Amino acid sequence: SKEYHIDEEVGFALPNPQENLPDFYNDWMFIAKHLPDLIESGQLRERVEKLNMLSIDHLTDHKSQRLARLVLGCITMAYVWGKGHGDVRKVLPRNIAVPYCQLSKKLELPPILVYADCVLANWKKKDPNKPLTYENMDVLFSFRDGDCSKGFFLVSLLVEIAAASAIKVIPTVFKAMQMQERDTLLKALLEIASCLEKALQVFHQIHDHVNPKAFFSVLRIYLSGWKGNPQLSDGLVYEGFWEDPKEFAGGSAGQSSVFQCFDVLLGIQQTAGGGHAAQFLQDMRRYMPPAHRNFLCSLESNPSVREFVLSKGDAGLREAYDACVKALVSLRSYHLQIVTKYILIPASQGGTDLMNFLKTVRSTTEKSLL
Ligand code: HEM
Ligand SMILES: Brc1ccc(-c2csc3nccn23)cc1
């Protein structure tokens, strides 16, 4: 893969994310570096209205314009949601809303916190010579002390890295179908399933680094957005850029490319059917980095791996393709049980609509067996 922005060690994650902005943007990072306290003390919101509108002409490289997208997104959620107790701002100050919107249209992303910001670009290594383990990693920004933002953002990022071992096989899968090497394709399909069989064990780390009550009551509030939300029934006013209020969806892992790139690979038509679940995942491709959004396009253009395995009558190929699909069904089933412990049960002490979305997705993945 070339120019699709896919590292081979971390995958869709941003490799070596930049931690510090230039000196010119010291007013921004100081606000973002100290979000837990500026929110509790009620100082944040005024300190955004007391900002001087800066210019993005001094963010040059890729890793700057991404971290600035991470900084102005963490700030925007804190301004809009405040302490996370219902008090909602409907207007975003123009001295920060303009450079955010200026930077978004440069990266073809929407002006809101997305999966690619606080998961894929929000990380670093403690010791830069030790492996990618939860113990050697940390996040760049949090929202509130005790929000379990580290365990949430990082366990998701570690799954994104276990999937990288399977994405470097994708070119060898398509080559083996054009040059027609059945034995090479079977090796590839079995290797992909093995990588997805190992990623399921990374999902277990969520139980030692995230709290149910602190995720439901606290963290889920700051990752929310303004789209069909009664708290901003019309949307958010981005002062300076649009005279109209705009609606953008909140933080969702439907913007994640890992589990989508395999549905596209294995021919699972998750994005067809005109349902609420099929609609949601296609819309969330606009919240994806344009290179990752284009890599998924190139996968949907290549010939189907399903319509190839099904056309040869090869009991060895069918059982390997089912190994890939059964690996996805297990991941999503474990993921479903996590939402039960972390959303449904806490809400019993809004969610049913969400757990139905995953069951629709898990079932479609499971109907694609052979
Ligand atoms: C406490 C932990 C977790 C909770 C409560 C949770 C919750 C949810 C919910 C409610 C949805 C559907 C609504 C939405 O998209 O916002 C979802 C979707 C999704 N989440 Fe999670 N999740 C957790 C952990 C993870 C992790 C660690 C990953 C790692 C990649 C992940 C990946 C995904 C994906 C790919 C989807 C899209 C559905 C699919 O493609 O199957 N989730 N999650
Ligand atoms: Br913004 C943002 C959007 C999504 C996530 C995320 C990682 S895993 C997971 N399940 C549901 C959401 N989600 C984290 C930050």
In order, the DSSP letters of 319-345 are HHHHHHHHHHHHHHHHHHHHHIIIIIH
- Strand, coil or helix: 164: helix
- Gyration radius from the chain CA atoms: 21
Find, among 110, 89, 94, 95, the residue nearest to 25 by Cα.
95
Residue to substitute in 335, 344, 345, 355 for testing ligand 1 pocket (most ligand atoms within 8 angstroms of CB): 335
- Dihedral over Cα of 268, 274, 275, 277: its sign: positive
Rounded to the nearest whole angstrom, what is the distance from the C-alpha of residue 318 to the centroid of ligand 2? 33
Residue 191 tokens read as 């290797």
Q: Which residue owns the Cα nearest ligand 2 atom 11?
A: 253
Rounded distance between C-alpha atoms, residue 58 and residue 25, angstroms: 9
Rounded distance between C-alpha atoms, residue 256 and residue 260, angstroms: 7
> Could you identify the residue written with the tokens 């491709």?
285
Residues 6+ apart with CB under 8 A from 238: 92, 97, 100, 101, 111, 246
Residue 311: DSSP 8-state: T
Residue 160 tokens read as 């994104």
| Partners of 246 in the β-ladder | 236
- Strand, coil or helix: 16: coil
Rounded distance between C-alpha atoms, residue 158 and residue 63, angstroms: 20
| Partners of 91 in the β-ladder | 237
Rounded distance between C-alpha atoms, residue 324 and residue 322, angstroms: 5
* Residue 280 CB neighbours (<10 A): 17
Residue 132 tokens read as 């990618």
Find, among 309, 311, 312, the residue nearest to 322 by Cα.
309
Rounded distance between C-alpha atoms, residue 259 and residue 330, angstroms: 12
> Is 73 a pocket residue for ligand 2 (Cβ < 6 Å)?
no
DSSP secondary structure letters along 194-244: HHHHHHHHHGGGGGGT--HHHIIIIIHHHT--BSS-GGGSS-EEETTT-SS
> Could you identify the residue written with the tokens 């997305």?
114
Nearest ligand 1 atom to the CA of 256 is 35
Resolution stated for this PDB structure, in Å:
3.0
Residue type, 25: Y
Residue 335 is assigned to a ligand binding site: yes
Rounded to the nearest whole angstrom, what is the distance from the C-alpha of residue 253 to the centroid of ligand 1? 5
CB of 87 within 8 A of CB of 128?
Answer: no
Rounded to the nearest whole angstrom, what is the distance from the C-alpha of residue 339 to the centroid of ligand 1? 8
> Could you identify the residue written with the tokens 């580290």?
150
Residue type, 2: K
The 3 state secondary structure assigned to 70-125 is HHHHHHHHHHHHCCCCCCCCCEECHHHHHHHHHHHHHHCCCCCCCHHHHHHCCCEE
Helix axes 258-265, 290-301, angle to 10 degrees: 10
The domain segmentation of the chain, as residue ranges, is: 1-17+146-223+249-370, 18-145+224-248
- Breaks after residues in the chain, judged by C–N over 2.5 Å: 349
Residue length, the chain? Answer: 370
Rounded distance between C-alpha atoms, residue 114 and residue 118, angstroms: 7
Residue 90 tokens read as 């409907």
Residues 6+ apart with CB under 8 A from 298: 4
| Partners of 248 in the β-ladder | 226
Report residue 179 CA to chain centroid gap.
Answer: 35
Structural biology method used: X-ray
